[PDB]
Amino acid sequence: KRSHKHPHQLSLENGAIRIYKTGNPHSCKVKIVPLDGNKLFNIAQRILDTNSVLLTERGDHIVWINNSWKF
Amino acid sequence: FISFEDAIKRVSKIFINSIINFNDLDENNFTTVPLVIDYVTPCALCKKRSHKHPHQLSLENGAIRIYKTGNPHSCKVKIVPLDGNKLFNIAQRILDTNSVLLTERGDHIVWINNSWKFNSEEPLITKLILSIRHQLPKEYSSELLCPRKRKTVEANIRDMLVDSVETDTYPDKLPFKNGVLDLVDGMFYSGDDAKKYTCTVSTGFKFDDTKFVEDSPEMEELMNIINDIQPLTDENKKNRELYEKTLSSCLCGATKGCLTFFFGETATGKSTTKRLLKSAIGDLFVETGQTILTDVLDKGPNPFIANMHLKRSVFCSELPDFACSGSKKIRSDNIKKLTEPCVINNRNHATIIIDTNYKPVFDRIDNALMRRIAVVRFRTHLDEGLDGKIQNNRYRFAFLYLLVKWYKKYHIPIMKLYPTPEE
Amino acid sequence: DAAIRGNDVIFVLKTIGVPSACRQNEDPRFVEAFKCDELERYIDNNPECTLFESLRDEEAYSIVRIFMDVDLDACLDEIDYLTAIQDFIIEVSNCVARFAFTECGAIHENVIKSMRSNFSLTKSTNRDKTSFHIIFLDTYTTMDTLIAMKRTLLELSRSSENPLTRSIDTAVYRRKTTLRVVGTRKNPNCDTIHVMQPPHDNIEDYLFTYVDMN
């Protein structure tokens, strides 16, 4: 569409974040996003975001410990 | 269905607050009597505060629906459906997308990151299940965060996959690592548009349309070079066609049962065309020596017999002269037993092509060999800049345009090569 | 195959529960055939009529569009209605595409593309009830494929939990099926009818017996 002259709006329902267009809701798409999920999944996400574990073409897993890559 | 007691437990679990008329609920009047909820905390359906109307339950399609008397928009409708497993539903939905398939080889192929990949020592199915969780409904998304549940879904997917399919069926499509190029007109499918083509191989590099254009000096000087190689001379009038055809047949995906030999003298760009073709193809193009053609390939180990698996074209050169006494001439039995459509699931479509500077000699000759002998020769006799052009490989797409045009002229009408028994 | 043969005449029953003998003899008071313009003119002239769409001969031409109906006895707000219908379309399209790839031998991607390309919505004037019929314009299929798809759709309706999905009335995949014409009264003394949507203003898109391959 073009610029969505009607402003968007936010809501929370059952722990899910919902985005919808005000005015005519049929002129856009309503989106839903989960909030947190599992705690261990969040820990895995945080660990992966540090780029400390990598996968090579050969199939190896390399980690960054004590200022050195090892496998 | 399930026992009524499990249903009562489920509806009681649905509502956070307690039920004061639970004892009044029976198996024969559970859809008529209203239920009164002790509203000490907001209900899970809608927060609000202290609903003043009792709710009610209805049984349709093997599901229990909760609806609040009065205005319907006050409280959200809740449904307890499908007394049964949820992970089976998730496995069904995942299989419905045709993202995982089974092949006769015994392994599975998975569609990840716009690529078909198969590998039997890693859990690709679990990776697919984790990745595809966004396309599923919200309530199914949080169910796949536990690895044990992912293993259960993977087991369900494995059990419900009985039929087997065969990959690499269309010989008229050349795969890339990020899509598939087509031979009918020369336009590049990208993304899910290439999903229908079950391709398990790739050229190893991107395809970009910017260099695949016609108005540029690069391929103009490319035809300049090839005219320096194959000029439009009467002596080449018979050669050109077949030569062009052979190059275009380098791109074909069907099995090749016809040999192709190039005869010429030293310093005659015959080795240069190897580089022009290999830069144009990539990893699919493969080299070979004289070790395998003159030796029995069915005796002892042969890594090349395993290696040609889904190779696109194979090139043989630097052949020593076989006319010398004591030099072991070629074995035509080999040249018979690679021309078959399969050399133990050895799917083979690599075009055999040979550059030699000597007249071949055969131990024994019949109609069969001469029926599948084709010969082509080159006519001219130094520009080192094009060598750098090839090493840094800016001349790919300009050359594949010539292959595609030649394929249009010759191979689109029919997939067939015409040999020349004359020599 | 069919090629030139394209259905354009609208066959209509003017009363539910027509006698069989009257149907075989083409009773003018129970059985009729209009065109698109004729049908809209007939509807416009008589707003109290009861017209019901069905086929005439199933042994010669049985090419129709893919139709299902939904009915929840619960009013819902707008945004949840949009989410429910989008989940409905994605589920049903994926399911029928899988069925076509498996049993019909078709190709999944073009089926999902054609079915997600265009679709029409209806609505009911009732304030406590939400019922609607969806018809897919660029999908064509025979009767036997539909009765085979009946079992698949019924397990899908049992399996899912979305409120719009659980109301798939599976019985409409039967021999000699009939569907109420949109904008027409159901009962002689009932004011509840169906209304159009802004996306589609043409009645030809609301009839499944009209076949026009583009």
XYZ file of C-alpha atoms in Angstrom:
708
model
C 0.000 0.000 0.000
C 1.012 3.677 0.190
C 2.166 5.029 3.555
C -0.829 3.723 5.579
C -2.404 7.123 6.202
C -4.493 5.548 8.961
C -2.208 5.051 11.992
C -1.447 1.576 13.300
C -2.245 0.307 16.795
C -0.981 -2.279 19.268
C -2.632 -4.713 21.666
C -1.819 -7.579 24.025
C -3.851 -10.791 24.168
C -2.976 -14.102 25.858
C 0.666 -13.069 26.087
C 0.786 -12.280 22.358
C 1.532 -8.870 20.847
C -0.928 -7.881 18.111
C -0.548 -5.136 15.497
C -3.543 -3.894 13.515
C -4.433 -0.910 11.337
C -6.969 1.596 12.653
C -9.820 2.907 10.532
C -10.433 0.107 8.038
C -8.739 -3.072 9.344
C -9.310 -4.773 5.974
C -6.878 -2.367 4.266
C -3.861 -3.979 5.984
C -2.815 -7.201 7.720
C -3.004 -8.009 11.432
C 0.219 -9.462 12.839
C 0.809 -11.570 15.955
C 4.095 -12.102 17.810
C 4.846 -14.397 20.778
C 6.341 -12.639 23.782
C 8.950 -14.887 25.419
C 8.553 -18.642 25.007
C 10.890 -20.974 26.894
C 13.671 -19.778 29.187
C 16.309 -22.229 27.952
C 15.441 -21.203 24.394
C 16.130 -17.585 25.365
C 19.464 -18.601 26.898
C 20.367 -20.420 23.679
C 19.416 -17.327 21.666
C 21.600 -15.096 23.842
C 24.553 -17.485 23.578
C 24.176 -17.747 19.800
C 23.998 -13.956 19.429
C 27.605 -13.690 20.662
C 28.922 -15.576 17.590
C 30.957 -17.947 19.762
C 29.829 -21.198 18.077
C 30.281 -21.705 14.342
C 29.741 -24.527 11.854
C 32.225 -25.280 9.078
C 31.603 -26.696 5.609
C 33.285 -29.913 6.777
C 30.740 -30.446 9.563
C 32.804 -29.289 12.549
C 31.632 -27.134 15.447
C 34.174 -24.512 16.532
C 33.953 -22.602 19.814
C 35.778 -19.526 21.110
C 37.255 -20.214 24.558
C 40.288 -18.571 26.195
C 41.172 -16.382 23.197
C 41.432 -19.298 20.767
C 39.188 -21.218 18.389
C 39.063 -24.956 19.059
C 37.358 -28.010 17.602
C -14.443 -40.196 22.570
C -12.799 -39.844 25.972
C -14.380 -40.290 29.393
C -16.521 -37.448 30.709
C -14.239 -37.026 33.739
C -11.302 -35.993 31.546
C -13.569 -33.434 29.864
C -14.577 -31.978 33.241
C -10.916 -31.808 34.248
C -10.066 -29.999 31.005
C -12.828 -27.400 31.359
C -11.904 -26.882 35.022
C -8.276 -26.360 33.974
C -9.401 -23.867 31.316
C -11.083 -21.629 33.903
C -8.647 -20.232 36.474
C -11.336 -19.655 39.103
C -13.199 -22.446 40.871
C -16.699 -23.732 40.092
C -19.342 -23.722 42.819
C -21.965 -25.847 40.997
C -19.509 -28.543 39.906
C -21.462 -31.229 41.776
C -24.587 -30.384 39.760
C -22.813 -31.270 36.501
C -23.685 -34.745 35.198
C -23.248 -36.720 31.979
C -26.848 -36.087 30.854
C -27.397 -32.368 31.585
C -23.979 -30.797 30.981
C -25.245 -28.584 28.129
C -28.312 -27.043 29.830
C -27.596 -26.062 33.446
C -25.652 -22.780 33.747
C -22.324 -22.784 35.566
C -21.595 -20.119 38.187
C -17.968 -19.034 38.578
C -16.564 -17.554 41.788
C -15.034 -14.434 40.225
C -12.181 -13.736 42.609
C -9.724 -13.358 39.692
C -10.318 -12.298 36.073
C -11.118 -15.135 33.694
C -8.483 -16.214 31.185
C -10.768 -15.524 28.208
C -11.203 -11.781 28.812
C -9.716 -9.839 31.710
C -12.482 -7.309 32.513
C -13.715 -7.729 36.098
C -16.378 -9.858 37.827
C -18.608 -11.060 35.004
C -22.271 -10.906 36.028
C -23.595 -13.550 33.604
C -23.124 -17.336 33.766
C -21.495 -19.090 30.832
C -22.631 -22.205 28.978
C -21.171 -25.166 27.105
C -22.149 -26.587 23.716
C -21.075 -29.825 22.022
C -20.385 -29.628 18.291
C -18.001 -31.609 16.070
C -16.550 -33.404 19.084
C -15.671 -30.084 20.725
C -16.891 -28.115 23.743
C -17.557 -24.405 23.172
C -17.895 -21.919 26.041
C -20.180 -18.939 25.410
C -21.255 -16.262 27.886
C -24.948 -15.467 28.232
C -25.905 -11.958 27.170
C -23.635 -9.888 24.956
C -21.172 -12.090 23.019
C -18.431 -9.473 22.699
C -17.893 -9.252 26.470
C -16.184 -12.651 26.805
C -14.061 -14.374 24.170
C -15.235 -17.762 22.903
C -13.117 -20.741 23.986
C -13.115 -24.216 22.432
C -11.850 -27.504 23.872
C -11.619 -29.642 20.703
C -10.223 -32.918 19.426
C -9.726 -35.250 22.348
C -6.433 -36.651 21.109
C -2.835 -35.815 20.324
C -1.587 -32.364 19.338
C 1.883 -33.387 18.143
C 0.289 -35.590 15.482
C -1.522 -32.499 14.197
C 1.768 -30.582 14.036
C 3.440 -33.452 12.182
C 0.536 -33.531 9.723
C 0.757 -29.781 9.104
C 4.521 -29.967 8.568
C 4.168 -32.879 6.138
C 1.384 -31.013 4.313
C 3.933 -28.439 3.092
C 5.962 -31.091 1.188
C 9.159 -29.805 2.790
C 10.557 -33.281 3.580
C 10.596 -36.124 1.054
C 11.877 -39.696 0.909
C 14.042 -41.102 -1.885
C 14.719 -44.657 -3.018
C 18.324 -44.252 -1.830
C 17.039 -44.757 1.728
C 17.694 -41.214 2.980
C 15.530 -38.098 3.269
C 15.703 -34.731 1.502
C 14.769 -31.498 3.284
C 14.003 -28.039 1.866
C 15.955 -25.474 3.910
C 17.135 -21.959 3.015
C 15.780 -22.255 -0.538
C 17.821 -25.408 -1.138
C 17.179 -29.151 -1.248
C 19.709 -30.919 0.972
C 20.135 -34.518 2.112
C 22.617 -35.752 4.708
C 22.231 -38.854 6.856
C 24.466 -38.050 9.863
C 22.827 -34.781 10.978
C 19.281 -34.079 12.251
C 17.977 -32.040 9.330
C 14.331 -32.780 10.158
C 14.610 -31.153 13.589
C 16.215 -28.083 12.009
C 13.328 -27.889 9.538
C 10.786 -28.229 12.356
C 12.434 -25.413 14.306
C 12.638 -23.199 11.220
C 9.087 -23.646 9.931
C 7.466 -22.824 13.278
C 6.485 -19.338 12.074
C 4.090 -20.592 9.386
C 2.156 -22.583 12.000
C -0.530 -21.006 14.212
C 0.503 -19.206 17.377
C -0.472 -21.977 19.797
C 1.579 -24.499 17.802
C 4.617 -22.192 17.836
C 5.331 -22.439 21.571
C 4.945 -26.235 21.455
C 8.085 -26.704 19.331
C 10.556 -25.012 21.693
C 11.210 -28.284 23.559
C 13.718 -30.622 21.853
C 11.927 -33.733 23.153
C 8.681 -32.668 21.485
C 10.670 -31.990 18.313
C 11.989 -35.561 18.475
C 8.428 -36.842 18.878
C 7.268 -34.847 15.843
C 10.265 -36.130 13.873
C 9.333 -39.712 14.754
C 5.745 -39.091 13.650
C 6.989 -37.639 10.354
C 9.244 -40.652 9.792
C 6.405 -43.109 10.424
C 3.897 -41.411 8.093
C 6.335 -41.283 5.136
C 5.860 -44.501 3.149
C 5.952 -43.539 -0.531
C 9.267 -42.793 -2.238
C 10.001 -40.219 -4.936
C 12.843 -39.839 -7.438
C 14.867 -36.634 -7.747
C 16.722 -35.056 -10.682
C 14.070 -35.861 -13.281
C 14.157 -32.870 -15.657
C 17.313 -32.727 -17.830
C 16.338 -29.285 -19.192
C 17.205 -27.266 -16.061
C 20.660 -26.304 -14.794
C 20.767 -25.724 -11.019
C 22.601 -23.007 -9.126
C 23.141 -22.642 -5.389
C 20.390 -19.985 -5.241
C 18.008 -21.117 -7.977
C 17.693 -22.829 -11.344
C 18.400 -21.548 -14.865
C 16.157 -22.823 -17.659
C 16.977 -23.716 -21.259
C 13.656 -22.894 -22.949
C 14.260 -19.121 -22.895
C 17.072 -18.365 -20.429
C 15.479 -16.803 -17.345
C 16.454 -17.589 -13.771
C 13.969 -19.035 -11.298
C 14.765 -17.979 -7.736
C 13.313 -18.942 -4.384
C 10.245 -21.133 -3.986
C 9.657 -20.997 -7.751
C 12.543 -23.480 -8.039
C 11.143 -25.772 -5.327
C 9.219 -27.911 -7.827
C 12.554 -28.841 -9.458
C 13.987 -31.573 -7.214
C 17.640 -30.671 -7.765
C 20.268 -31.938 -5.316
C 23.336 -30.472 -7.076
C 24.629 -26.971 -7.744
C 27.215 -25.089 -9.780
C 28.738 -23.472 -6.685
C 28.215 -19.780 -7.459
C 25.477 -17.178 -7.726
C 23.659 -16.224 -10.909
C 23.306 -12.496 -11.583
C 21.314 -11.043 -14.471
C 23.517 -7.940 -14.796
C 26.239 -9.827 -16.680
C 23.630 -11.909 -18.553
C 22.836 -9.172 -21.085
C 23.563 -8.938 -24.792
C 24.560 -5.294 -25.422
C 28.141 -5.153 -24.133
C 31.618 -5.315 -25.724
C 32.614 -8.397 -23.701
C 30.866 -11.037 -25.754
C 31.480 -9.064 -28.966
C 35.197 -9.571 -28.437
C 34.297 -13.112 -27.330
C 32.980 -13.897 -30.810
C 36.097 -12.111 -32.064
C 38.199 -14.662 -30.162
C 36.133 -17.651 -31.279
C 36.330 -16.488 -34.904
C 40.077 -16.386 -34.332
C 39.459 -19.987 -33.220
C 36.648 -21.131 -35.549
C 36.370 -18.674 -38.452
C 33.453 -18.780 -40.882
C 35.607 -20.562 -43.454
C 34.343 -23.205 -45.881
C 36.688 -25.762 -44.298
C 34.877 -25.133 -40.998
C 31.390 -25.074 -42.560
C 30.908 -28.755 -41.749
C 32.763 -28.462 -38.429
C 31.004 -25.443 -36.912
C 27.532 -26.972 -36.555
C 28.751 -30.163 -34.906
C 31.247 -28.232 -32.796
C 28.542 -25.868 -31.580
C 26.202 -28.787 -30.973
C 28.809 -30.571 -28.876
C 29.309 -27.515 -26.688
C 25.563 -27.125 -26.244
C 25.277 -30.844 -25.525
C 27.748 -30.212 -22.704
C 24.798 -28.572 -20.926
C 22.315 -31.425 -21.459
C 21.123 -33.546 -18.547
C 20.291 -36.766 -20.391
C 22.566 -39.788 -20.649
C 25.287 -39.631 -23.308
C 26.146 -42.718 -25.346
C 28.206 -41.035 -28.091
C 31.912 -40.248 -27.910
C 33.423 -37.002 -29.185
C 37.079 -36.592 -30.178
C 38.887 -33.418 -31.238
C 41.941 -33.768 -33.479
C 44.596 -31.114 -33.972
C 48.224 -30.125 -33.555
C 50.221 -28.372 -30.845
C 49.527 -24.796 -29.683
C 46.000 -24.915 -31.094
C 43.822 -23.526 -28.299
C 42.405 -26.991 -27.626
C 43.412 -26.653 -23.971
C 42.010 -23.103 -23.917
C 38.490 -24.334 -24.713
C 38.755 -26.538 -21.622
C 39.129 -23.399 -19.503
C 36.345 -21.563 -21.341
C 33.984 -24.488 -20.718
C 35.005 -25.102 -17.097
C 34.655 -21.430 -16.173
C 31.205 -21.590 -17.770
C 30.094 -24.717 -15.843
C 31.947 -24.884 -12.518
C 32.267 -27.875 -10.192
C 30.065 -30.092 -12.380
C 32.766 -30.144 -15.069
C 35.371 -32.813 -14.303
C 38.772 -33.825 -15.685
C 40.125 -37.319 -16.232
C 43.413 -38.910 -17.220
C 44.412 -41.887 -19.336
C 44.571 -44.253 -16.345
C 40.922 -45.318 -16.489
C 40.198 -45.529 -20.231
C 42.921 -48.124 -20.914
C 42.329 -50.129 -17.709
C 39.400 -52.297 -16.644
C 37.165 -50.217 -14.366
C 35.270 -53.223 -12.951
C 38.460 -54.722 -11.460
C 39.754 -53.293 -8.197
C 38.829 -49.988 -6.577
C 38.034 -47.055 -8.855
C 37.345 -43.688 -7.186
C 36.360 -42.182 -10.548
C 33.517 -44.704 -10.879
C 32.105 -43.303 -7.635
C 33.000 -39.711 -8.551
C 31.079 -39.232 -11.811
C 27.825 -39.401 -9.790
C 25.631 -36.625 -11.264
C 28.572 -35.025 -13.055
C 27.615 -32.818 -15.986
C 30.585 -33.263 -18.340
C 33.906 -35.121 -18.310
C 37.009 -34.087 -20.265
C 39.933 -36.322 -21.243
C 43.159 -34.984 -22.747
C 46.968 -35.326 -22.625
C 46.770 -38.788 -24.199
C 50.171 -40.271 -25.101
C 50.476 -41.638 -28.616
C 49.234 -45.235 -28.627
C 51.102 -46.159 -31.826
C 54.317 -46.788 -29.872
C 55.204 -50.442 -29.382
C 54.721 -51.480 -25.771
C 52.285 -48.634 -25.111
C 49.038 -50.243 -23.972
C 46.332 -49.078 -26.380
C 42.845 -48.094 -25.269
C 40.373 -50.789 -24.213
C 37.145 -50.438 -26.183
C 35.368 -52.593 -23.587
C 35.534 -49.624 -21.216
C 34.157 -47.285 -23.881
C 31.240 -49.689 -24.233
C 30.627 -50.000 -20.501
C 30.467 -46.297 -19.688
C 28.024 -45.563 -22.532
C 25.243 -47.302 -20.584
C 22.597 -45.194 -18.798
C 24.048 -46.420 -15.480
C 27.600 -47.534 -14.723
C 24.860 -49.389 -8.775
C 22.576 -46.332 -8.822
C 25.332 -44.559 -10.777
C 23.097 -41.941 -12.380
C 25.329 -40.746 -15.208
C 24.791 -37.938 -17.707
C 28.312 -36.478 -17.961
C 29.178 -35.892 -21.611
C 32.446 -37.597 -22.539
C 34.696 -35.291 -24.556
C 38.312 -35.881 -25.588
C 41.071 -33.661 -26.962
C 43.844 -35.702 -28.578
C 46.775 -34.922 -30.868
C 47.164 -38.478 -32.220
C 45.112 -40.826 -34.370
C 43.441 -43.402 -32.088
C 44.113 -47.109 -32.569
C 41.698 -49.841 -31.479
C 42.487 -53.466 -30.671
C 39.271 -54.689 -32.320
C 36.678 -52.792 -34.361
C 33.120 -53.571 -35.462
C 29.962 -51.688 -36.422
C 29.222 -50.859 -32.773
C 32.260 -48.625 -32.241
C 32.005 -46.725 -35.536
C 28.299 -46.155 -34.871
C 29.339 -43.953 -31.911
C 32.505 -42.163 -33.106
C 32.301 -38.404 -33.705
C 35.224 -36.209 -34.780
C 35.699 -32.431 -34.922
C 38.778 -30.318 -35.621
C 39.902 -26.726 -35.113
C 41.333 -24.397 -37.788
C 43.766 -21.606 -36.928
C 47.158 -21.214 -35.252
C 48.806 -14.938 -29.102
C 46.474 -12.952 -26.822
C 47.355 -13.406 -23.145
C 44.760 -10.914 -21.873
C 41.906 -13.365 -22.389
C 43.859 -15.760 -20.165
C 43.542 -13.260 -17.315
C 39.894 -12.759 -18.241
C 39.417 -16.509 -17.764
C 41.391 -16.743 -14.513
C 39.340 -14.001 -12.873
C 36.262 -15.428 -14.628
C 34.320 -12.466 -15.991
C 33.426 -14.355 -19.201
C 30.919 -16.888 -17.861
C 27.494 -15.496 -18.697
C 28.521 -14.107 -22.082
C 29.568 -17.657 -22.967
C 26.517 -19.444 -21.546
C 24.477 -17.113 -23.749
C 26.182 -18.719 -26.749
C 25.529 -22.183 -25.311
C 21.855 -21.305 -24.770
C 21.491 -19.939 -28.306
C 23.125 -23.062 -29.747
C 20.860 -25.241 -27.590
C 17.906 -23.332 -29.042
C 19.156 -23.944 -32.581
C 19.949 -27.650 -32.179
C 18.858 -29.407 -28.990
C 15.386 -27.962 -28.286
C 14.009 -29.746 -31.403
C 15.443 -33.073 -30.189
C 17.958 -34.502 -27.717
C 20.206 -36.390 -30.123
C 23.838 -36.324 -31.243
C 24.842 -37.341 -34.761
C 28.142 -39.269 -34.858
C 30.378 -39.598 -37.921
C 31.417 -43.234 -38.549
C 33.854 -41.920 -41.177
C 36.730 -41.938 -38.665
C -10.365 -32.036 -23.067
C -13.280 -29.649 -22.543
C -11.530 -26.742 -24.312
C -14.420 -24.989 -26.063
C -17.005 -26.435 -23.656
C -17.497 -23.789 -20.976
C -20.535 -23.689 -18.705
C -22.353 -20.348 -18.657
C -26.068 -21.149 -18.128
C -27.309 -20.950 -14.535
C -29.572 -23.836 -13.488
C -31.904 -23.008 -10.605
C -34.432 -24.787 -8.395
C -37.186 -22.470 -7.170
C -38.247 -24.534 -4.131
C -36.460 -26.845 -1.696
C -37.553 -30.477 -1.873
C -38.626 -30.545 -5.518
C -40.342 -33.795 -6.582
C -38.150 -36.038 -8.710
C -40.830 -36.578 -11.369
C -41.250 -32.823 -11.808
C -37.471 -32.484 -12.160
C -37.271 -35.136 -14.893
C -39.986 -33.327 -16.878
C -38.448 -29.846 -16.356
C -41.359 -28.327 -14.459
C -41.411 -24.562 -15.195
C -42.663 -23.876 -11.653
C -39.771 -25.711 -9.958
C -36.894 -25.878 -12.471
C -35.514 -22.995 -14.519
C -32.405 -21.833 -16.368
C -31.228 -18.219 -16.680
C -28.077 -16.366 -17.676
C -26.103 -13.971 -15.489
C -28.055 -10.907 -16.636
C -31.349 -12.819 -16.650
C -30.688 -14.101 -13.136
C -29.854 -10.676 -11.701
C -32.920 -9.164 -13.385
C -35.123 -11.942 -11.985
C -33.685 -11.403 -8.497
C -34.134 -7.628 -8.764
C -37.767 -7.852 -9.887
C -38.722 -10.336 -7.139
C -36.976 -9.728 -3.785
C -39.145 -12.279 -1.925
C -38.244 -15.231 -4.160
C -36.368 -18.355 -3.056
C -33.820 -19.545 -5.628
C -31.394 -22.407 -5.074
C -28.423 -23.306 -7.283
C -27.696 -26.853 -8.466
C -26.572 -28.831 -11.501
C -28.877 -30.662 -13.919
C -26.892 -33.576 -15.402
C -23.880 -34.990 -13.572
C -23.015 -37.761 -16.055
C -21.827 -35.454 -18.864
C -20.462 -32.181 -17.429
C -19.206 -32.176 -13.835
C -16.700 -29.297 -13.785
C -17.266 -26.951 -10.831
C -15.377 -24.611 -8.522
C -14.311 -25.602 -5.006
C -16.983 -24.653 -2.454
C -17.332 -24.898 1.312
C -19.495 -23.133 3.895
C -18.886 -22.158 7.534
C -21.313 -21.398 10.374
C -20.496 -20.430 13.967
C -23.309 -19.397 16.316
C -21.128 -16.714 17.893
C -20.476 -13.094 16.958
C -16.820 -12.038 16.821
C -15.027 -8.714 16.577
C -13.324 -7.543 13.397
C -9.626 -8.190 14.020
C -10.109 -11.715 15.380
C -12.364 -12.358 12.380
C -9.528 -11.364 10.031
C -7.016 -13.577 11.843
C -9.467 -16.486 11.867
C -10.191 -16.195 8.149
C -6.503 -15.901 7.201
C -5.694 -19.030 9.210
C -8.718 -20.684 7.592
C -7.481 -19.936 4.065
C -3.896 -21.006 4.724
C -4.979 -24.295 6.339
C -7.578 -25.228 3.726
C -5.344 -24.289 0.788
C -2.367 -26.227 2.142
C -4.565 -29.268 2.823
C -6.247 -29.411 -0.580
C -2.888 -28.801 -2.269
C -1.440 -31.798 -0.421
C -4.454 -33.894 -1.427
C -4.118 -32.859 -5.081
C -0.391 -33.627 -5.107
C -0.926 -37.031 -3.486
C -4.148 -38.426 -4.961
C -4.866 -36.198 -7.976
C -1.274 -36.027 -9.233
C -1.298 -32.234 -9.598
C 1.503 -29.831 -8.610
C 1.406 -28.164 -5.196
C 2.752 -24.686 -5.964
C 0.413 -23.723 -8.807
C -2.574 -24.998 -6.812
C -1.687 -22.820 -3.832
C -1.000 -19.866 -6.147
C -4.320 -20.118 -7.994
C -6.272 -20.674 -4.780
C -4.577 -17.815 -2.905
C -4.964 -15.536 -5.945
C -8.702 -14.800 -5.758
C -11.468 -15.718 -3.314
C -14.873 -14.254 -2.487
C -16.539 -13.664 0.871
C -20.164 -13.490 1.969
C -21.836 -12.388 5.189
C -25.093 -12.865 7.079
C -27.376 -10.093 8.317
C -27.721 -11.908 11.656
C -26.058 -10.175 14.603
C -25.641 -13.328 16.743
C -24.560 -15.665 13.917
C -21.538 -15.660 11.602
C -22.026 -17.710 8.428
C -20.328 -17.321 5.056
C -19.657 -19.213 1.838
C -16.268 -19.016 0.131
C -15.810 -20.033 -3.509
C -12.435 -20.288 -5.255
C -12.559 -18.806 -8.751
C -9.392 -20.216 -10.365
C -9.776 -23.829 -9.170
C -11.833 -26.441 -11.028
C -12.660 -30.002 -10.014
C -15.118 -32.858 -10.589
C -17.624 -34.473 -8.227
C -15.626 -37.612 -7.416
C -12.565 -35.611 -6.405
C -14.835 -33.654 -4.051
C -16.389 -36.726 -2.428
C -12.877 -38.133 -1.990
C -11.809 -34.779 -0.494
C -14.793 -35.023 1.879
C -13.021 -37.468 4.208
C -9.840 -35.363 4.165
C -11.709 -32.163 5.005
C -13.595 -33.866 7.813
C -10.424 -35.039 9.545
C -8.970 -31.558 8.974
C -12.000 -29.973 10.649
C -11.700 -32.404 13.557
C -7.935 -31.852 13.816
C -7.795 -28.052 13.828
C -9.031 -25.822 16.642
C -9.514 -22.426 14.987
C -13.157 -21.358 15.503
C -13.782 -20.765 11.793
C -12.326 -24.155 10.831
C -14.472 -26.263 13.179
C -17.679 -25.225 11.365
C -16.804 -26.783 8.002
C -20.089 -28.475 7.092
C -18.796 -31.535 5.252
C -22.179 -32.875 4.063
C -22.239 -30.448 1.098
C -20.025 -32.926 -0.768
C -22.886 -35.225 -1.745
C -24.612 -36.279 -4.951
C -27.134 -33.791 -6.378
C -25.973 -31.051 -4.021
C -27.689 -27.667 -3.805
C -26.514 -24.322 -2.429
C -28.532 -21.239 -1.536
C -28.205 -18.371 -4.000
C -26.625 -15.320 -2.388
C -28.913 -12.363 -1.788
C -31.969 -14.646 -1.792
C -34.300 -15.604 1.047
C -33.955 -19.088 2.524
C -37.431 -19.505 4.056
C -40.618 -17.835 2.759
C -41.048 -16.057 6.125
C -37.400 -15.429 7.053
C -35.616 -12.099 6.588
C -32.089 -13.513 7.012
C -30.188 -13.324 3.709
C -26.607 -13.028 2.465
C -24.768 -9.866 1.420
C -21.855 -9.137 -0.905
C -18.340 -7.831 -0.173
C -16.630 -4.737 -1.615
C -13.960 -6.861 -3.379
C -16.560 -8.497 -5.661
C -19.601 -6.693 -7.081
C -20.513 -9.311 -9.719
C -22.826 -12.278 -9.170
C -20.924 -14.440 -11.682
C -18.126 -14.749 -9.111
C -20.649 -15.987 -6.510
C -21.892 -18.996 -8.524
C -19.803 -22.168 -8.598
C -21.499 -23.649 -11.681
C -20.089 -20.868 -13.882
C -16.896 -22.102 -15.560
C -14.564 -19.677 -17.343
C -10.923 -20.714 -17.729
C -8.411 -17.887 -18.072
